[PDB]
mmCIF file of C-alpha atoms in Angstrom:
data_model
loop_
_atom_site.group_PDB
_atom_site.id
_atom_site.type_symbol
_atom_site.label_atom_id
_atom_site.label_comp_id
_atom_site.label_asym_id
_atom_site.label_seq_id
_atom_site.Cartn_x
_atom_site.Cartn_y
_atom_site.Cartn_z
ATOM 1 C CA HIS A 1 -25.607 -21.129 14.760
ATOM 2 C CA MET A 2 -24.950 -23.481 11.853
ATOM 3 C CA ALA A 3 -26.905 -21.537 8.977
ATOM 4 C CA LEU A 4 -24.100 -21.315 6.220
ATOM 5 C CA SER A 5 -23.077 -21.553 2.666
ATOM 6 C CA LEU A 6 -19.423 -22.032 1.886
ATOM 7 C CA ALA A 7 -17.666 -22.604 -1.080
ATOM 8 C CA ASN A 8 -14.120 -24.215 -1.201
ATOM 9 C CA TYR A 9 -12.038 -23.531 -4.205
ATOM 10 C CA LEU A 10 -8.657 -24.495 -2.440
ATOM 11 C CA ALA A 11 -7.337 -27.821 -2.340
ATOM 12 C CA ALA A 12 -4.698 -29.407 -0.403
ATOM 13 C CA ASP A 13 -2.759 -31.302 -3.295
ATOM 14 C CA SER A 14 -2.705 -27.837 -5.047
ATOM 15 C CA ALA A 15 -1.427 -25.896 -1.930
ATOM 16 C CA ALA A 16 1.287 -28.438 -1.416
ATOM 17 C CA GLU A 17 2.748 -28.377 -5.124
ATOM 18 C CA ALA A 18 2.678 -24.472 -4.938
ATOM 19 C CA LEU A 19 4.785 -24.243 -1.550
ATOM 20 C CA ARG A 20 7.315 -26.928 -3.101
ATOM 21 C CA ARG A 21 7.691 -24.212 -6.275
ATOM 22 C CA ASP A 22 7.904 -21.172 -4.095
ATOM 23 C CA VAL A 23 10.440 -22.538 -1.690
ATOM 24 C CA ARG A 24 12.478 -24.176 -4.238
ATOM 25 C CA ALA A 25 12.692 -20.681 -5.992
ATOM 26 C CA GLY A 26 13.539 -18.641 -2.909
ATOM 27 C CA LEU A 27 15.984 -20.699 -1.473
ATOM 28 C CA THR A 28 18.112 -21.508 -4.717
ATOM 29 C CA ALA A 29 18.192 -17.762 -5.708
ATOM 30 C CA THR A 30 21.425 -15.973 -4.998
ATOM 31 C CA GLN A 31 19.758 -13.438 -2.920
ATOM 32 C CA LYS A 32 17.744 -15.924 -0.653
ATOM 33 C CA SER A 33 14.234 -15.363 0.051
ATOM 34 C CA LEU A 34 10.989 -17.204 1.143
ATOM 35 C CA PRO A 35 7.505 -16.887 -0.114
ATOM 36 C CA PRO A 36 5.057 -15.071 2.021
ATOM 37 C CA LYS A 37 2.233 -16.930 0.844
ATOM 38 C CA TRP A 38 3.112 -19.837 3.381
ATOM 39 C CA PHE A 39 3.829 -17.853 6.511
ATOM 40 C CA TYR A 40 0.838 -18.061 7.813
ATOM 41 C CA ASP A 41 -0.331 -21.486 9.034
ATOM 42 C CA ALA A 42 -2.375 -21.996 12.248
ATOM 43 C CA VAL A 43 0.982 -21.182 14.456
ATOM 44 C CA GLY A 44 2.111 -18.239 12.464
ATOM 45 C CA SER A 45 -1.530 -16.669 11.810
ATOM 46 C CA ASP A 46 -2.039 -16.741 15.575
ATOM 47 C CA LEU A 47 1.192 -14.885 16.357
ATOM 48 C CA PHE A 48 0.255 -12.488 13.678
ATOM 49 C CA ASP A 49 -3.102 -11.954 15.767
ATOM 50 C CA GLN A 50 -0.792 -11.207 18.769
ATOM 51 C CA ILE A 51 1.362 -8.957 16.781
ATOM 52 C CA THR A 52 -1.721 -6.656 16.450
ATOM 53 C CA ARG A 53 -2.121 -6.051 20.254
ATOM 54 C CA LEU A 54 1.533 -5.028 20.681
ATOM 55 C CA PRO A 55 2.079 -1.690 21.913
ATOM 56 C CA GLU A 56 4.646 -0.614 18.945
ATOM 57 C CA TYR A 57 2.226 -2.195 16.210
ATOM 58 C CA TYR A 58 -0.105 1.024 15.661
ATOM 59 C CA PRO A 59 -2.016 -0.247 12.496
ATOM 60 C CA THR A 60 -4.624 -2.306 14.267
ATOM 61 C CA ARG A 61 -5.830 0.602 16.926
ATOM 62 C CA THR A 62 -5.449 3.390 14.502
ATOM 63 C CA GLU A 63 -7.424 1.793 11.789
ATOM 64 C CA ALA A 64 -10.054 0.931 14.742
ATOM 65 C CA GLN A 65 -9.999 4.317 15.956
ATOM 66 C CA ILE A 66 -11.082 5.577 12.602
ATOM 67 C CA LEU A 67 -13.704 3.239 12.172
ATOM 68 C CA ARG A 68 -14.957 3.858 15.529
ATOM 69 C CA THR A 69 -15.504 7.439 14.794
ATOM 70 C CA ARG A 70 -16.465 7.400 10.909
ATOM 71 C CA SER A 71 -18.229 3.966 10.353
ATOM 72 C CA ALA A 72 -21.742 5.649 10.203
ATOM 73 C CA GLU A 73 -20.346 8.191 7.507
ATOM 74 C CA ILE A 74 -18.915 4.945 5.585
ATOM 75 C CA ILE A 75 -22.113 3.027 5.955
ATOM 76 C CA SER A 76 -24.386 6.133 4.672
ATOM 77 C CA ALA A 77 -21.445 6.663 1.799
ATOM 78 C CA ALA A 78 -21.758 3.155 0.684
ATOM 79 C CA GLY A 79 -25.766 2.481 0.540
ATOM 80 C CA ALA A 80 -24.668 -1.306 0.715
ATOM 81 C CA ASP A 81 -26.861 -3.975 2.161
ATOM 82 C CA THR A 82 -24.202 -6.531 1.699
ATOM 83 C CA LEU A 83 -20.482 -6.695 3.424
ATOM 84 C CA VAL A 84 -17.919 -8.669 1.619
ATOM 85 C CA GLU A 85 -14.766 -8.890 3.838
ATOM 86 C CA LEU A 86 -11.532 -9.924 2.274
ATOM 87 C CA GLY A 87 -9.933 -11.742 5.006
ATOM 88 C CA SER A 88 -11.357 -13.395 7.995
ATOM 89 C CA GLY A 89 -14.409 -12.357 9.960
ATOM 90 C CA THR A 90 -13.234 -12.380 13.599
ATOM 91 C CA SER A 91 -12.198 -8.717 14.057
ATOM 92 C CA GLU A 92 -13.988 -6.051 16.048
ATOM 93 C CA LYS A 93 -13.395 -3.870 13.016
ATOM 94 C CA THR A 94 -15.866 -6.400 11.090
ATOM 95 C CA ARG A 95 -18.650 -5.943 13.818
ATOM 96 C CA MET A 96 -17.956 -1.921 13.792
ATOM 97 C CA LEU A 97 -19.112 -2.227 9.922
ATOM 98 C CA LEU A 98 -21.922 -4.586 10.592
ATOM 99 C CA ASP A 99 -23.469 -2.709 13.703
ATOM 100 C CA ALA A 100 -23.695 0.547 11.613
ATOM 101 C CA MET A 101 -25.221 -1.214 8.609
ATOM 102 C CA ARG A 102 -27.886 -2.783 11.206
ATOM 103 C CA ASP A 103 -28.184 0.745 12.864
ATOM 104 C CA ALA A 104 -29.153 1.971 9.300
ATOM 105 C CA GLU A 105 -31.427 -0.794 8.855
ATOM 106 C CA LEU A 106 -29.576 -2.013 5.553
ATOM 107 C CA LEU A 107 -27.644 -5.056 6.620
ATOM 108 C CA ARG A 108 -28.909 -7.984 4.558
ATOM 109 C CA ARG A 109 -25.692 -10.396 3.890
ATOM 110 C CA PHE A 110 -22.337 -10.787 4.924
ATOM 111 C CA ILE A 111 -19.403 -12.540 2.519
ATOM 112 C CA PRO A 112 -16.326 -13.400 4.567
ATOM 113 C CA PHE A 113 -13.519 -14.604 1.772
ATOM 114 C CA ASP A 114 -10.571 -16.224 3.409
ATOM 115 C CA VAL A 115 -8.412 -19.325 2.946
ATOM 116 C CA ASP A 116 -9.212 -21.163 5.988
ATOM 117 C CA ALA A 117 -12.481 -22.567 5.830
ATOM 118 C CA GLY A 118 -12.417 -23.434 9.665
ATOM 119 C CA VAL A 119 -12.091 -19.607 10.542
ATOM 120 C CA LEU A 120 -15.016 -18.953 7.853
ATOM 121 C CA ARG A 121 -17.230 -21.642 9.822
ATOM 122 C CA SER A 122 -16.374 -19.921 12.942
ATOM 123 C CA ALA A 123 -17.211 -16.394 11.770
ATOM 124 C CA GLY A 124 -20.299 -17.712 10.254
ATOM 125 C CA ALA A 125 -21.536 -18.991 13.606
ATOM 126 C CA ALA A 126 -20.591 -15.897 15.531
ATOM 127 C CA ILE A 127 -22.161 -13.313 12.962
ATOM 128 C CA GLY A 128 -24.991 -15.400 12.722
ATOM 129 C CA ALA A 129 -25.709 -15.462 16.161
ATOM 130 C CA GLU A 130 -25.199 -11.725 16.651
ATOM 131 C CA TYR A 131 -27.160 -10.446 13.545
ATOM 132 C CA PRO A 132 -30.220 -12.774 13.496
ATOM 133 C CA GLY A 133 -31.451 -13.594 9.975
ATOM 134 C CA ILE A 134 -28.252 -12.184 8.283
ATOM 135 C CA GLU A 135 -27.568 -14.405 5.096
ATOM 136 C CA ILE A 136 -23.984 -15.821 5.164
ATOM 137 C CA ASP A 137 -22.332 -16.761 1.993
ATOM 138 C CA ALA A 138 -18.871 -17.841 2.809
ATOM 139 C CA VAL A 139 -15.938 -18.395 0.313
ATOM 140 C CA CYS A 140 -12.818 -20.033 0.764
ATOM 141 C CA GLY A 141 -10.030 -19.112 -1.928
ATOM 142 C CA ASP A 142 -7.224 -16.801 -2.441
ATOM 143 C CA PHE A 143 -7.907 -13.585 -3.279
ATOM 144 C CA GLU A 144 -5.342 -13.513 -6.045
ATOM 145 C CA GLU A 145 -7.434 -16.165 -7.954
ATOM 146 C CA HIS A 146 -10.750 -16.569 -6.869
ATOM 147 C CA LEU A 147 -12.093 -12.971 -6.780
ATOM 148 C CA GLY A 148 -14.376 -13.718 -9.582
ATOM 149 C CA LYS A 149 -16.215 -16.460 -7.242
ATOM 150 C CA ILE A 150 -17.334 -13.761 -4.915
ATOM 151 C CA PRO A 151 -21.488 -13.622 -5.191
ATOM 152 C CA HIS A 152 -22.802 -10.324 -6.837
ATOM 153 C CA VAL A 153 -25.988 -10.382 -5.086
ATOM 154 C CA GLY A 154 -26.668 -7.154 -3.624
ATOM 155 C CA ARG A 155 -25.250 -3.758 -3.308
ATOM 156 C CA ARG A 156 -21.760 -4.781 -2.038
ATOM 157 C CA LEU A 157 -19.369 -3.170 0.252
ATOM 158 C CA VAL A 158 -16.043 -5.041 -0.315
ATOM 159 C CA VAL A 159 -13.686 -4.176 2.520
ATOM 160 C CA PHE A 160 -9.861 -4.874 2.384
ATOM 161 C CA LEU A 161 -8.500 -3.586 6.122
ATOM 162 C CA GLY A 162 -5.596 -3.788 7.813
ATOM 163 C CA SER A 163 -3.190 -2.414 5.226
ATOM 164 C CA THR A 164 -3.125 -6.347 4.084
ATOM 165 C CA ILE A 165 -2.695 -4.657 0.677
ATOM 166 C CA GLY A 166 0.877 -3.591 1.531
ATOM 167 C CA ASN A 167 1.804 -7.130 1.396
ATOM 168 C CA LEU A 168 1.725 -6.934 -2.113
ATOM 169 C CA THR A 169 4.579 -5.522 -4.098
ATOM 170 C CA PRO A 170 3.759 -2.919 -6.834
ATOM 171 C CA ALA A 171 3.170 -5.503 -9.807
ATOM 172 C CA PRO A 172 0.866 -8.207 -8.170
ATOM 173 C CA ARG A 173 -0.664 -5.228 -6.137
ATOM 174 C CA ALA A 174 -1.485 -3.533 -9.402
ATOM 175 C CA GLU A 175 -2.840 -6.883 -10.811
ATOM 176 C CA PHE A 176 -4.927 -7.425 -7.737
ATOM 177 C CA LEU A 177 -6.744 -4.174 -7.765
ATOM 178 C CA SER A 178 -7.348 -4.383 -11.334
ATOM 179 C CA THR A 179 -8.804 -7.942 -10.938
ATOM 180 C CA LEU A 180 -10.672 -6.331 -7.981
ATOM 181 C CA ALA A 181 -12.286 -3.538 -9.415
ATOM 182 C CA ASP A 182 -13.459 -5.585 -12.321
ATOM 183 C CA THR A 183 -15.872 -7.466 -10.329
ATOM 184 C CA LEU A 184 -17.428 -4.276 -9.023
ATOM 185 C CA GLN A 185 -20.823 -3.313 -10.337
ATOM 186 C CA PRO A 186 -22.410 0.163 -10.360
ATOM 187 C CA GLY A 187 -23.410 0.805 -6.884
ATOM 188 C CA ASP A 188 -20.636 -1.398 -5.215
ATOM 189 C CA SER A 189 -18.009 0.235 -3.186
ATOM 190 C CA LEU A 190 -14.292 -0.733 -2.019
ATOM 191 C CA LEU A 191 -13.356 0.372 1.305
ATOM 192 C CA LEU A 192 -9.435 -0.141 1.359
ATOM 193 C CA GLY A 193 -6.970 0.360 4.398
ATOM 194 C CA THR A 194 -3.529 1.858 3.767
ATOM 195 C CA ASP A 195 -0.781 2.054 6.390
ATOM 196 C CA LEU A 196 1.025 5.513 5.562
ATOM 197 C CA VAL A 197 4.824 6.403 5.351
ATOM 198 C CA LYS A 198 5.725 8.178 8.626
ATOM 199 C CA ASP A 199 8.797 8.425 11.015
ATOM 200 C CA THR A 200 10.927 5.413 10.243
ATOM 201 C CA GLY A 201 11.960 4.598 13.644
ATOM 202 C CA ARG A 202 8.144 3.810 14.412
ATOM 203 C CA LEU A 203 7.626 1.882 11.372
ATOM 204 C CA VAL A 204 10.805 -0.407 12.221
ATOM 205 C CA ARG A 205 9.876 -0.600 15.889
ATOM 206 C CA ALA A 206 5.988 -1.939 14.552
ATOM 207 C CA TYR A 207 7.966 -5.007 13.242
ATOM 208 C CA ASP A 208 10.449 -5.470 15.731
ATOM 209 C CA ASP A 209 8.585 -5.467 19.054
ATOM 210 C CA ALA A 210 10.278 -5.325 22.309
ATOM 211 C CA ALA A 211 8.688 -8.624 23.480
ATOM 212 C CA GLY A 212 10.134 -10.728 20.469
ATOM 213 C CA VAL A 213 6.806 -11.626 19.401
ATOM 214 C CA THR A 214 7.371 -10.699 15.482
ATOM 215 C CA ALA A 215 10.838 -12.323 15.912
ATOM 216 C CA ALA A 216 8.847 -15.670 16.326
ATOM 217 C CA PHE A 217 6.447 -14.825 13.743
ATOM 218 C CA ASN A 218 9.524 -14.575 11.565
ATOM 219 C CA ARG A 219 11.386 -17.692 12.763
ATOM 220 C CA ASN A 220 8.053 -19.815 12.333
ATOM 221 C CA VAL A 221 8.303 -19.393 8.667
ATOM 222 C CA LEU A 222 11.362 -22.118 9.070
ATOM 223 C CA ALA A 223 9.151 -24.246 11.455
ATOM 224 C CA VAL A 224 6.790 -24.548 8.323
ATOM 225 C CA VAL A 225 9.448 -25.549 5.948
ATOM 226 C CA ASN A 226 10.706 -28.069 8.215
ATOM 227 C CA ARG A 227 7.438 -29.502 8.682
ATOM 228 C CA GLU A 228 5.888 -29.397 5.237
ATOM 229 C CA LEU A 229 9.091 -30.008 3.404
ATOM 230 C CA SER A 230 11.204 -32.253 5.740
ATOM 231 C CA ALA A 231 13.651 -29.584 6.118
ATOM 232 C CA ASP A 232 16.315 -29.231 9.262
ATOM 233 C CA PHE A 233 16.498 -25.352 9.703
ATOM 234 C CA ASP A 234 17.689 -24.555 13.196
ATOM 235 C CA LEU A 235 15.347 -21.538 14.559
ATOM 236 C CA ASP A 236 17.676 -20.905 16.913
ATOM 237 C CA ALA A 237 20.461 -20.202 14.591
ATOM 238 C CA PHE A 238 18.634 -17.205 12.816
ATOM 239 C CA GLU A 239 18.307 -13.726 13.812
ATOM 240 C CA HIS A 240 15.136 -11.444 13.120
ATOM 241 C CA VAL A 241 16.082 -8.109 11.329
ATOM 242 C CA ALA A 242 13.517 -5.408 10.420
ATOM 243 C CA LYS A 243 14.526 -3.039 8.123
ATOM 244 C CA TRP A 244 13.088 0.142 6.268
ATOM 245 C CA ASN A 245 13.943 0.186 2.528
ATOM 246 C CA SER A 246 13.683 3.973 1.550
ATOM 247 C CA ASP A 247 13.978 3.258 -1.782
ATOM 248 C CA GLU A 248 10.623 1.058 -2.315
ATOM 249 C CA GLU A 249 9.168 2.476 1.021
ATOM 250 C CA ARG A 250 8.616 -0.604 2.622
ATOM 251 C CA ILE A 251 9.207 -2.442 5.621
ATOM 252 C CA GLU A 252 11.200 -5.707 4.748
ATOM 253 C CA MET A 253 11.763 -8.647 7.538
ATOM 254 C CA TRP A 254 14.629 -10.447 7.281
ATOM 255 C CA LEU A 255 16.289 -13.661 8.737
ATOM 256 C CA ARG A 256 20.040 -13.688 9.475
ATOM 257 C CA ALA A 257 22.207 -16.676 9.961
ATOM 258 C CA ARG A 258 24.378 -16.163 13.316
ATOM 259 C CA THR A 259 26.884 -18.933 12.231
ATOM 260 C CA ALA A 260 27.083 -20.861 9.051
ATOM 261 C CA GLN A 261 24.189 -23.439 8.142
ATOM 262 C CA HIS A 262 23.808 -26.205 6.000
ATOM 263 C CA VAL A 263 20.134 -27.040 5.679
ATOM 264 C CA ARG A 264 18.710 -29.743 3.846
ATOM 265 C CA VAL A 265 15.307 -29.845 2.368
ATOM 266 C CA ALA A 266 14.368 -33.365 1.875
ATOM 267 C CA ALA A 267 11.050 -33.144 -0.148
ATOM 268 C CA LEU A 268 12.916 -31.259 -2.625
ATOM 269 C CA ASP A 269 16.191 -33.276 -2.878
ATOM 270 C CA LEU A 270 17.776 -29.824 -2.087
ATOM 271 C CA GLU A 271 20.823 -28.812 0.088
ATOM 272 C CA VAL A 272 21.295 -25.061 0.821
ATOM 273 C CA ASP A 273 24.246 -23.276 2.620
ATOM 274 C CA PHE A 274 23.918 -19.976 4.591
ATOM 275 C CA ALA A 275 27.172 -18.122 5.210
ATOM 276 C CA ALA A 276 27.724 -16.358 8.511
ATOM 277 C CA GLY A 277 25.602 -13.196 8.311
ATOM 278 C CA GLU A 278 23.704 -14.145 5.208
ATOM 279 C CA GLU A 279 20.448 -12.619 5.364
ATOM 280 C CA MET A 280 17.335 -14.047 3.636
ATOM 281 C CA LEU A 281 14.074 -11.839 2.770
ATOM 282 C CA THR A 282 10.714 -12.866 4.364
ATOM 283 C CA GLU A 283 7.761 -10.563 4.677
ATOM 284 C CA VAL A 284 7.694 -6.974 3.099
ATOM 285 C CA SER A 285 4.999 -4.436 4.297
ATOM 286 C CA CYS A 286 4.639 -1.459 1.726
ATOM 287 C CA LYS A 287 3.652 1.859 3.072
ATOM 288 C CA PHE A 288 1.976 4.510 1.140
ATOM 289 C CA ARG A 289 1.715 8.182 0.469
ATOM 290 C CA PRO A 290 -1.939 9.833 0.261
ATOM 291 C CA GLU A 291 -1.824 11.127 -3.186
ATOM 292 C CA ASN A 292 -0.382 7.799 -4.538
ATOM 293 C CA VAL A 293 -3.574 5.848 -3.063
ATOM 294 C CA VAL A 294 -5.745 8.072 -5.029
ATOM 295 C CA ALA A 295 -3.437 7.179 -8.377
ATOM 296 C CA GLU A 296 -3.319 3.319 -7.778
ATOM 297 C CA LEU A 297 -6.745 3.130 -7.050
ATOM 298 C CA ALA A 298 -7.405 5.302 -10.639
ATOM 299 C CA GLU A 299 -5.120 2.949 -12.439
ATOM 300 C CA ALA A 300 -7.313 0.025 -11.322
ATOM 301 C CA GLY A 301 -10.385 1.823 -12.570
ATOM 302 C CA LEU A 302 -11.446 3.188 -9.205
ATOM 303 C CA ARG A 303 -12.609 6.598 -8.092
ATOM 304 C CA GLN A 304 -11.704 7.462 -4.724
ATOM 305 C CA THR A 305 -14.885 9.280 -3.156
ATOM 306 C CA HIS A 306 -13.723 9.230 0.378
ATOM 307 C CA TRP A 307 -10.757 9.537 2.671
ATOM 308 C CA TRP A 308 -10.462 8.915 6.250
ATOM 309 C CA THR A 309 -7.708 9.248 8.191
ATOM 310 C CA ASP A 310 -6.362 9.642 11.725
ATOM 311 C CA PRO A 311 -5.130 13.285 13.072
ATOM 312 C CA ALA A 312 -1.646 12.020 13.205
ATOM 313 C CA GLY A 313 -1.750 10.910 9.476
ATOM 314 C CA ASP A 314 -0.673 7.401 10.331
ATOM 315 C CA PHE A 315 -3.251 5.327 8.597
ATOM 316 C CA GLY A 316 -5.855 6.027 5.885
ATOM 317 C CA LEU A 317 -9.221 4.425 4.517
ATOM 318 C CA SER A 318 -10.606 5.045 1.063
ATOM 319 C CA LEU A 319 -13.931 4.478 -0.353
ATOM 320 C CA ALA A 320 -13.703 4.135 -4.068
ATOM 321 C CA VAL A 321 -16.036 3.022 -6.847
ATOM 322 C CA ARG A 322 -16.273 2.291 -10.578
#
């Protein structure tokens, strides 16, 4: 139920100032963009959750099927008694790993790391109930600044699923993996999910679903700016566009102005203009080739010891060690 330890390294005032800096930079650039760090408020996070269940969004069920069939092998390979989860604690994927650790009579500790303390408290309560006696040490932080705050107690399996790593472009991605690798002791393991290059139509449809849910997620980034920075974006005036960028092998989401728009962002003392048809970059989702996953891990100081992939080659999971 309520047994918990929780450390909180994210302050409201610090987040508000970062949002102001990031939005000003994006909206005043000649090629406009909005910073994805701020897309995932409560509404945005729930819309993303819904995306994970859409028929076109293959990553979640694909990764789940890999875990469903290989979680025992993963847990045996890791030999860990402590599961560190980078992001959330709410998914069935988490429970597949915890269940396998319990089956192996190894499970002692769960360390969820996420930006939302409320979500962490919910996860603590649910997991504490399901695995009586488990120690839960939650960390509320940003995995680009607070990885050093993750406790080093135990033999730790650190998991970063969902190809969330694809939301980082190459420079911050390398910095993240390097920083993460530096926190791993001998005996610790990283389990990394990566969505793989594949048929471009399938890739684009995963981010442009027939039901319009991804489009709602995308437009909600404007609602966040409207609310937090007292802006007057007309959500209805922007069209959702998903593209495959073949040079960078990433999906890009864009908002395209239907007609010319004048936007006042009062909190920034800023007025910006969109031409009819002008596009603004929002979320990106980098996709990987299996050989390059090995190389990226090696560049960070990690050796890939295991690779699991579905039979169609849609998605991959790596286990890697120092």
